């Protein structure tokens, strides 16, 4: 019996059976390293949606960009609400960027101990807030 055959017999057995899956997300303990990886996917997906919506609307929608800015100027009567737009835009970008560096450092083989994950993770978190508040006011 080969390794490839053992896998086919594993799947043919268990799918055609009434065996339940043991719970996974429902039961598993949340850790900072873990929560931060999901965020990197989330921020990734969100930032792609941003770029794609911005690009497609440069093809599907009429009028120039400055024309569309005059449309944002019209709606608004709010001062700090513009900052909230800027903070909400820049927040996911900064997060993904910093944590991206952390990912690239990992790919080099460095910083892969559990204590280091907590440290590097916290430094990323603190760096996001600062550069997000930092950029929002420009």
């Amino acid at each position: 019996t080969t390794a490839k055959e053992e896998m086919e017999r594993f799947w043919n057995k268990n799918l055609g059976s009434n065996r339940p899956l043991s719970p996974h997300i429902t039961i598993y303990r949340w850790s900072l390293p873990m929560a931060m990886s999901i965020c990197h996917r989330g921020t990734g997906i969100a930032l792609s949606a941003g770029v794609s919506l911005f690009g497609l609307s440069a093809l599907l929608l009429p009028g120039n960009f400055e024309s569309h800015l005059e449309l944002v100027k019209s709606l608004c009567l709010g001062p700090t609400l513009i900052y909230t737009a800027k903070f909400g835009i820049v927040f996911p970008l900064m997060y993904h960027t910093w944590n991206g560096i952390r990912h690239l450092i990992w790919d080099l083989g460095k910083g892969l101990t559990i204590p280091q994950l907590t440290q590097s993770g916290v430094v990323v978190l603190i760096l996001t807030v600062l550069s997000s508040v930092g950029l929002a006011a420009m």
Binding site: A3, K4, E6, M7, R9, F10, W11, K13, N14, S17, N18, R19, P20, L21, S22, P23, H24, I27, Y28, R29, W30, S31, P33, M34, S37, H103, W106, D107, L108, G109, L112, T113, I114, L117
Partner: protein, 239 residues
């Protein structure tokens, strides 16, 4: 007198249309060993002999008792019970596995994946084997520390979300660390083709460095770091 509560995942395949449920047991800790397995054995022996689980060494080297205690994958024989009585220990089978019965998961696929990397020494000329001990220097040997110790308890792989969603085609940290174990063993002559085996999008490349594996290994090993070290060899080996 000192009662501690345990919430255990139960399922009996022999009962007509039984579905998975939790069951509570209560144990005086003054008549019990310090480890979780001690409790499991005690409730098995004294309260409910319908409780089914894998165990052998009670020492943390066989890897039989791997399960999910309080949201983390470890060895029951090695995790001591939280003496805090107000809390209730939640015992679960290893995540995203098919449950044969109670806390006993079907590890058949896991074992097969181990088989598919050829976990043994390979030489280009094996006609001289069994007569001369192969030479390996102290330093060449240190490279195997933190890799050979692996118990195959399956705690790590079974905690990797990539291994949940893609357990069929993704090998997982346990098996991956072992391929690395043989890659850097100086006595092995098949390093390049061992790396060439991982040349697809699923076998190695479903790792996205979630690092739950290293965080959960009952033996203190670092499978994710070994994975990272593979990814590097994969990009740098020529021909």
């Amino acid at each position: 007198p000192r009662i501690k509560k345990f919430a255990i995942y139960r399922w009996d395949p022999d009962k007509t249309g039984d579905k998975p449920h939790m069951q509570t047991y209560e144990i005086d800790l003054n008549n019990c060993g310090p480890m979780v397995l001690d409790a499991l054995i005690k409730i098995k022996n004294e309260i409910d002999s319908t409780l089914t689980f894998r165990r052998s060494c009670r020492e943390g080297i066989c890897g039989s008792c791997a399960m999910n205690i309080n949201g983390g994958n470890t060895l029951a024989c090695t995790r001591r019970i939280d003496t805090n009585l107000d809390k209730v220990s939640k015992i679960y089978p290893l995540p995203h596995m098919y449950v044969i019965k109670d806390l006993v998961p079907d590890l058949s696929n896991f074992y097969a994946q181990y088989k598919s990397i050829e976990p043994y020494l390979k030489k280009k000329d094996e006609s001289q084997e069994g007569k001369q001990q192969y030479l390996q220097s102290i330093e060449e040997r240190e490279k195997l520390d933190g890799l050979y110790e692996c118990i195959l308890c399956a705690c790590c792989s079974t905690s990797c979300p990539s291994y949940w969603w893609n357990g069929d085609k993704y090998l997982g940290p346990a098996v991956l660390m072992q391929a690395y174990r043989w890659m850097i063993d100086s006595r092995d002559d098949f390093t390049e083709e061992r790396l060439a085996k991982l040349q697809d999008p699923f076998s190695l490349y479903r790792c996205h460095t979630i690092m739950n594996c290293t965080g959960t290994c009952p033996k203190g090993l670092n499978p994710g770091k070994a994975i990272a070290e593979i990814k590097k060899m994969m990009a740098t080996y020529k021909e």
